[PDB]
Amino acid sequence: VYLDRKLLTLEDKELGSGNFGTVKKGYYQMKKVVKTVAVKILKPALKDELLAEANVMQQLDNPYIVRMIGICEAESWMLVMEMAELGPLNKYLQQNRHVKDKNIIELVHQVSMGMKYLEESNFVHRDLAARNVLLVTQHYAKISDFGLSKALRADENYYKAKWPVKWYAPECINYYKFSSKSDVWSFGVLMWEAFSYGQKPYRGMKGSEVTAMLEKGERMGCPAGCPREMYDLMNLCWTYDVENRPGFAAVELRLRNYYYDVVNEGHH
Ligand SMILES: COc1cc(Nc2ncc(F)c(Nc3ccc4c(n3)NC(=O)C(C)(C)O4)n2)cc(OC)c1OC
């Protein structure tokens, strides 16, 4: 998990900013090859957040989840991860409005596979949104930003807690309870975003207005050109009662089946 600072090269080209510090592009010398990396570089709390994030990613091993290369203490604390070259899913779709329907289904299904793995691993993401799905290629998506993520206790299926309200299930808002099912709810908002080509959900509404809207049984409308089968899945993800809402196993299967229908139809 601990990396050799001299084996790491940093570019001055920035990928993002925040109170934590900056994320920059770089290269790390592996056993024989050079690997392109994204490096989170810190500006006590911030450090322990970083180490907790690192410790979560250290446990995870999946094609559809950004990999950690390791960590590094030097000028600042550094978290070195594999680079997703195409950037965040929302910005991508905003900038490429001609991405096809089969292709969006393919990506969101890839996210359901990453999330199925995380459910199986008993981790809650807690920040699953299109901004946190990074593209390796136009046909290869990975889940990132595990800064809010939690390993679940062996005896509990939920974690008890500024919040991204628009992606949050009622039980999170009302009882501060975050489970894989509440991640499923975010996945539904994430789906809406992807079929809206990266538009913010609940446009023009404040967090409390959204809460009031959902409480009243109201949901976001079908995005233009979204297949009814995919909008149905969004709504199913938006099931108020945690206990009736599907888990990622069922969600991923629904998406898998439908993608193969669209893959089949294309050939016909
Ligand atoms: C090539 O263009 C881009 C590429 C990437 N690739 C990429 N791969 C793996 C990663 F771990 C990674 N991490 C990362 C990067 C930046 C960040 C954050 N994380 N976190 C943040 O809170 C904000 C969002 C503040 O800045 N980025 C991300 C882009 O934005 C996330 C982007 O657009 C600039």
Short mmCIF file of C-alpha atoms and ligand atoms in Angstrom, two decimals:
data_model
loop_
_atom_site.label_atom_id
_atom_site.label_comp_id
_atom_site.label_asym_id
_atom_site.label_seq_id
_atom_site.Cartn_x
_atom_site.Cartn_y
_atom_site.Cartn_z
CA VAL A 1 0.00 0.00 0.00
CA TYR A 2 2.97 2.36 0.53
CA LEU A 3 4.58 3.77 -2.58
CA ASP A 4 8.01 5.10 -3.47
CA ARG A 5 7.75 8.90 -3.97
CA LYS A 6 10.72 8.87 -6.38
CA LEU A 7 8.94 6.23 -8.54
CA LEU A 8 6.02 8.69 -8.91
CA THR A 9 5.98 11.49 -11.48
CA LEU A 10 3.50 14.38 -11.22
CA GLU A 11 2.28 16.61 -14.04
CA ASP A 12 1.20 20.17 -13.27
CA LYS A 13 -2.05 19.53 -15.16
CA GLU A 14 -4.88 19.50 -12.64
CA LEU A 15 -7.94 17.22 -12.76
CA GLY A 16 -9.89 18.85 -9.93
CA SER A 17 -9.90 20.95 -6.77
CA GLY A 18 -11.54 21.08 -3.34
CA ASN A 19 -10.93 21.79 0.34
CA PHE A 20 -9.07 18.46 0.57
CA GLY A 21 -6.47 19.69 -1.94
CA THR A 22 -6.02 18.79 -5.63
CA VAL A 23 -6.19 15.78 -7.96
CA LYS A 24 -3.42 15.69 -10.58
CA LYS A 25 -2.39 13.35 -13.41
CA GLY A 26 0.81 11.31 -13.11
CA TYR A 27 2.83 8.16 -13.78
CA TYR A 28 3.96 5.34 -11.52
CA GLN A 29 6.80 2.92 -12.27
CA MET A 30 5.39 -0.59 -11.80
CA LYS A 31 7.46 -3.81 -11.99
CA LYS A 32 8.36 -3.24 -15.67
CA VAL A 33 5.74 -0.93 -17.20
CA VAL A 34 4.77 2.67 -16.44
CA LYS A 35 1.20 3.17 -15.26
CA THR A 36 -0.77 6.40 -15.76
CA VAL A 37 -2.36 7.53 -12.51
CA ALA A 38 -4.73 10.03 -10.93
CA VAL A 39 -3.27 11.36 -7.71
CA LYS A 40 -5.27 12.90 -4.88
CA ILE A 41 -2.90 15.31 -3.03
CA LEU A 42 -3.94 16.79 0.32
CA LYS A 43 -4.04 20.51 1.14
CA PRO A 44 -5.66 15.86 10.86
CA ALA A 45 -9.21 15.15 9.66
CA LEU A 46 -8.28 15.31 5.95
CA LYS A 47 -5.50 12.71 6.43
CA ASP A 48 -7.74 10.22 8.25
CA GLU A 49 -10.41 10.68 5.58
CA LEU A 50 -7.71 9.85 3.01
CA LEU A 51 -6.52 6.76 4.91
CA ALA A 52 -10.11 5.54 5.42
CA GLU A 53 -10.76 5.97 1.69
CA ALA A 54 -7.50 4.13 0.94
CA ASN A 55 -8.43 1.34 3.36
CA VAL A 56 -11.79 0.86 1.66
CA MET A 57 -10.32 0.67 -1.85
CA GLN A 58 -7.58 -1.63 -0.57
CA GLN A 59 -10.31 -4.18 0.07
CA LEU A 60 -11.98 -3.93 -3.35
CA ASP A 61 -11.13 -5.88 -6.47
CA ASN A 62 -13.46 -5.49 -9.46
CA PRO A 63 -13.31 -4.50 -13.18
CA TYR A 64 -15.99 -1.82 -12.68
CA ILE A 65 -14.46 -0.03 -9.71
CA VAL A 66 -11.48 2.35 -9.93
CA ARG A 67 -8.33 0.65 -8.53
CA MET A 68 -6.05 2.12 -5.92
CA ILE A 69 -2.33 1.77 -6.71
CA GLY A 70 -1.41 2.77 -3.15
CA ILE A 71 -0.56 5.73 -0.93
CA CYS A 72 2.41 8.06 -0.41
CA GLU A 73 3.57 10.59 2.22
CA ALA A 74 5.88 13.34 0.93
CA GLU A 75 5.21 17.08 0.48
CA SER A 76 1.62 16.10 1.27
CA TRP A 77 -0.39 12.91 1.77
CA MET A 78 -1.14 11.30 -1.59
CA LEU A 79 -3.66 8.75 -2.82
CA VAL A 80 -2.56 7.25 -6.12
CA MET A 81 -5.24 5.66 -8.30
CA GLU A 82 -5.52 4.31 -11.81
CA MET A 83 -6.43 6.97 -14.38
CA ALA A 84 -9.84 6.98 -16.13
CA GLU A 85 -8.92 8.93 -19.30
CA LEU A 86 -12.39 10.07 -20.48
CA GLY A 87 -13.50 11.59 -17.18
CA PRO A 88 -16.91 11.74 -15.46
CA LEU A 89 -20.01 10.17 -17.08
CA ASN A 90 -22.22 13.27 -16.78
CA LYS A 91 -19.71 15.68 -18.42
CA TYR A 92 -19.08 13.09 -21.13
CA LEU A 93 -22.75 12.75 -22.11
CA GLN A 94 -23.25 16.54 -21.94
CA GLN A 95 -20.36 16.88 -24.40
CA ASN A 96 -21.34 13.89 -26.59
CA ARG A 97 -25.07 14.09 -27.18
CA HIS A 98 -24.94 11.55 -29.99
CA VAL A 99 -24.01 8.61 -27.73
CA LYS A 100 -26.43 5.84 -28.62
CA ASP A 101 -29.08 4.21 -26.46
CA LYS A 102 -27.47 0.74 -26.42
CA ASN A 103 -24.25 2.45 -25.27
CA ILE A 104 -25.83 4.20 -22.28
CA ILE A 105 -27.50 0.92 -21.28
CA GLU A 106 -24.09 -0.79 -21.61
CA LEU A 107 -22.46 1.76 -19.25
CA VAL A 108 -25.19 1.90 -16.57
CA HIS A 109 -25.26 -1.89 -16.64
CA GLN A 110 -21.51 -1.89 -16.03
CA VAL A 111 -22.22 0.31 -13.01
CA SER A 112 -24.80 -2.19 -11.73
CA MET A 113 -22.12 -4.89 -11.93
CA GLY A 114 -19.66 -2.79 -9.92
CA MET A 115 -22.45 -2.12 -7.45
CA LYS A 116 -23.53 -5.77 -7.29
CA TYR A 117 -19.92 -6.55 -6.28
CA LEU A 118 -20.00 -3.84 -3.61
CA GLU A 119 -23.30 -5.15 -2.21
CA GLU A 120 -21.75 -8.63 -2.12
CA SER A 121 -18.73 -7.16 -0.32
CA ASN A 122 -21.03 -5.46 2.23
CA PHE A 123 -19.78 -1.94 1.53
CA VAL A 124 -22.09 1.06 1.10
CA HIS A 125 -20.97 3.68 -1.44
CA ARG A 126 -23.16 6.58 -0.19
CA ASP A 127 -22.21 8.93 -3.06
CA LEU A 128 -23.26 7.04 -6.17
CA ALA A 129 -23.92 9.68 -8.82
CA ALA A 130 -23.06 10.19 -12.51
CA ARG A 131 -20.22 12.60 -11.50
CA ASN A 132 -18.61 9.60 -9.73
CA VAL A 133 -18.78 7.19 -12.68
CA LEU A 134 -15.54 7.57 -14.66
CA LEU A 135 -15.00 6.40 -18.21
CA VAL A 136 -12.00 4.39 -19.29
CA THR A 137 -13.48 4.23 -22.78
CA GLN A 138 -16.86 5.23 -24.29
CA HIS A 139 -17.69 1.54 -23.62
CA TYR A 140 -16.03 1.02 -20.21
CA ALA A 141 -17.27 2.59 -16.96
CA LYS A 142 -15.86 2.41 -13.41
CA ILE A 143 -17.22 3.58 -10.03
CA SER A 144 -15.08 6.09 -8.08
CA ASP A 145 -15.01 8.44 -5.05
CA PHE A 146 -15.15 6.18 -2.01
CA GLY A 147 -14.61 9.04 0.46
CA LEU A 148 -18.07 8.61 2.00
CA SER A 149 -18.10 4.81 1.78
CA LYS A 150 -18.45 2.48 4.78
CA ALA A 151 -17.71 -1.15 5.54
CA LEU A 152 -20.88 -2.58 7.11
CA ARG A 153 -20.74 -4.18 10.58
CA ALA A 154 -21.08 -7.99 10.52
CA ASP A 155 -24.39 -7.76 12.44
CA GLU A 156 -26.00 -4.86 10.53
CA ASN A 157 -27.07 -4.25 6.91
CA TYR A 158 -26.95 -0.43 7.25
CA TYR A 159 -24.61 2.35 8.38
CA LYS A 160 -25.90 5.00 10.79
CA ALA A 161 -24.67 8.54 10.11
CA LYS A 162 -23.07 18.36 3.64
CA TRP A 163 -25.27 15.75 1.92
CA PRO A 164 -26.00 15.14 -1.81
CA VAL A 165 -29.74 15.03 -0.94
CA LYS A 166 -30.90 14.63 -4.58
CA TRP A 167 -29.29 11.17 -4.74
CA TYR A 168 -30.51 10.00 -1.31
CA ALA A 169 -33.24 7.57 -0.34
CA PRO A 170 -36.02 8.63 2.09
CA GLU A 171 -34.61 6.36 4.84
CA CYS A 172 -31.25 8.22 4.62
CA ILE A 173 -32.97 11.61 4.95
CA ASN A 174 -35.42 10.48 7.64
CA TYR A 175 -33.45 7.96 9.71
CA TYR A 176 -29.81 8.60 8.63
CA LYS A 177 -29.61 4.96 7.50
CA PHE A 178 -27.44 3.97 4.55
CA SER A 179 -27.65 0.46 3.13
CA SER A 180 -27.06 -1.11 -0.29
CA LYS A 181 -30.77 -0.55 -0.96
CA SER A 182 -30.20 3.18 -0.42
CA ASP A 183 -27.38 2.89 -2.97
CA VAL A 184 -29.95 1.33 -5.32
CA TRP A 185 -32.00 4.53 -4.94
CA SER A 186 -28.94 6.60 -5.98
CA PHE A 187 -28.42 4.20 -8.91
CA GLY A 188 -31.90 5.20 -10.12
CA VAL A 189 -31.03 8.90 -9.97
CA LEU A 190 -27.72 7.99 -11.68
CA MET A 191 -29.76 6.15 -14.41
CA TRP A 192 -32.00 9.20 -14.93
CA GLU A 193 -28.90 11.41 -15.26
CA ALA A 194 -27.36 9.10 -17.89
CA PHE A 195 -30.49 9.00 -20.00
CA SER A 196 -30.80 12.77 -19.62
CA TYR A 197 -27.29 13.10 -21.04
CA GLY A 198 -25.76 14.43 -17.82
CA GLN A 199 -28.46 16.86 -16.68
CA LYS A 200 -28.67 17.58 -12.95
CA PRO A 201 -31.68 15.81 -11.39
CA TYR A 202 -34.57 17.78 -9.84
CA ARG A 203 -33.51 20.92 -11.75
CA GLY A 204 -34.23 24.22 -9.98
CA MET A 205 -35.33 22.57 -6.74
CA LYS A 206 -33.79 22.87 -3.29
CA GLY A 207 -33.10 19.72 -1.25
CA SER A 208 -36.19 20.15 0.94
CA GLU A 209 -38.50 20.63 -2.06
CA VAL A 210 -37.17 17.32 -3.46
CA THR A 211 -37.90 15.61 -0.14
CA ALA A 212 -41.42 17.04 -0.14
CA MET A 213 -41.87 15.94 -3.79
CA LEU A 214 -40.84 12.30 -3.09
CA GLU A 215 -42.91 12.08 0.09
CA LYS A 216 -45.94 12.92 -2.09
CA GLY A 217 -45.28 9.90 -4.35
CA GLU A 218 -43.90 12.15 -7.11
CA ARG A 219 -40.97 11.05 -9.29
CA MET A 220 -38.93 12.57 -12.15
CA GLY A 221 -40.44 12.07 -15.61
CA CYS A 222 -39.11 9.82 -18.37
CA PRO A 223 -36.18 11.54 -20.12
CA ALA A 224 -36.59 12.17 -23.86
CA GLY A 225 -35.85 8.99 -25.83
CA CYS A 226 -35.45 6.76 -22.76
CA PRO A 227 -36.79 3.25 -23.38
CA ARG A 228 -39.85 2.61 -21.19
CA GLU A 229 -38.17 -0.55 -19.81
CA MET A 230 -35.31 1.56 -18.44
CA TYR A 231 -37.60 4.21 -17.02
CA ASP A 232 -39.54 1.39 -15.33
CA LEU A 233 -36.28 0.29 -13.69
CA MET A 234 -35.61 3.85 -12.48
CA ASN A 235 -39.01 3.91 -10.81
CA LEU A 236 -38.50 0.48 -9.26
CA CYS A 237 -35.19 1.78 -7.85
CA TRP A 238 -37.21 4.71 -6.47
CA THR A 239 -39.32 2.45 -4.25
CA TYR A 240 -40.09 4.34 -1.06
CA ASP A 241 -40.06 1.36 1.28
CA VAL A 242 -36.48 0.04 1.69
CA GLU A 243 -37.83 -3.47 2.22
CA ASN A 244 -39.68 -3.56 -1.11
CA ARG A 245 -36.90 -1.91 -3.14
CA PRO A 246 -34.77 -4.35 -5.20
CA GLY A 247 -31.09 -5.00 -4.42
CA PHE A 248 -28.31 -4.79 -7.02
CA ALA A 249 -28.47 -8.51 -7.77
CA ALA A 250 -32.00 -8.09 -9.23
CA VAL A 251 -31.24 -4.64 -10.71
CA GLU A 252 -28.11 -5.86 -12.53
CA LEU A 253 -30.03 -8.91 -13.88
CA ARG A 254 -32.84 -6.68 -15.22
CA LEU A 255 -30.25 -4.52 -16.99
CA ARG A 256 -28.26 -7.54 -18.21
CA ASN A 257 -31.34 -9.12 -19.78
CA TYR A 258 -32.45 -5.88 -21.40
CA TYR A 259 -29.01 -5.03 -22.79
CA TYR A 260 -28.88 -8.44 -24.50
CA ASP A 261 -32.31 -7.75 -26.04
CA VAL A 262 -31.03 -4.45 -27.45
CA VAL A 263 -27.82 -6.19 -28.56
CA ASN A 264 -29.98 -8.85 -30.27
CA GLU A 265 -32.40 -6.37 -31.91
CA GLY A 266 -29.46 -4.42 -33.39
CA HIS A 267 -28.40 -7.54 -35.29
CA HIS A 268 -31.94 -7.95 -36.64
C1 LIG B 1 -9.61 13.65 -18.15
O1 LIG B 1 -10.51 14.49 -17.42
C2 LIG B 1 -10.85 13.90 -16.22
C3 LIG B 1 -10.35 12.65 -15.88
C4 LIG B 1 -10.69 12.04 -14.66
N1 LIG B 1 -10.14 10.77 -14.41
C5 LIG B 1 -9.96 10.21 -13.16
N2 LIG B 1 -9.63 8.92 -13.09
C6 LIG B 1 -9.45 8.32 -11.92
C7 LIG B 1 -9.60 9.06 -10.75
F1 LIG B 1 -9.45 8.50 -9.54
C8 LIG B 1 -9.94 10.40 -10.85
N3 LIG B 1 -10.10 11.12 -9.67
C9 LIG B 1 -10.51 12.45 -9.55
C10 LIG B 1 -10.15 13.44 -10.47
C11 LIG B 1 -10.57 14.75 -10.27
C12 LIG B 1 -11.34 15.03 -9.14
C13 LIG B 1 -11.65 14.00 -8.25
N4 LIG B 1 -11.24 12.76 -8.48
N5 LIG B 1 -12.42 14.27 -7.11
C14 LIG B 1 -13.08 15.45 -7.05
O2 LIG B 1 -13.77 15.69 -6.08
C15 LIG B 1 -12.97 16.45 -8.19
C16 LIG B 1 -14.17 16.30 -9.13
C17 LIG B 1 -12.99 17.87 -7.60
O3 LIG B 1 -11.75 16.31 -8.93
N6 LIG B 1 -10.10 10.94 -12.06
C18 LIG B 1 -11.55 12.72 -13.78
C19 LIG B 1 -12.06 13.99 -14.11
O4 LIG B 1 -12.90 14.70 -13.28
C20 LIG B 1 -13.28 13.95 -12.12
C21 LIG B 1 -11.70 14.58 -15.33
O5 LIG B 1 -12.22 15.81 -15.67
C22 LIG B 1 -11.37 16.90 -15.32
#
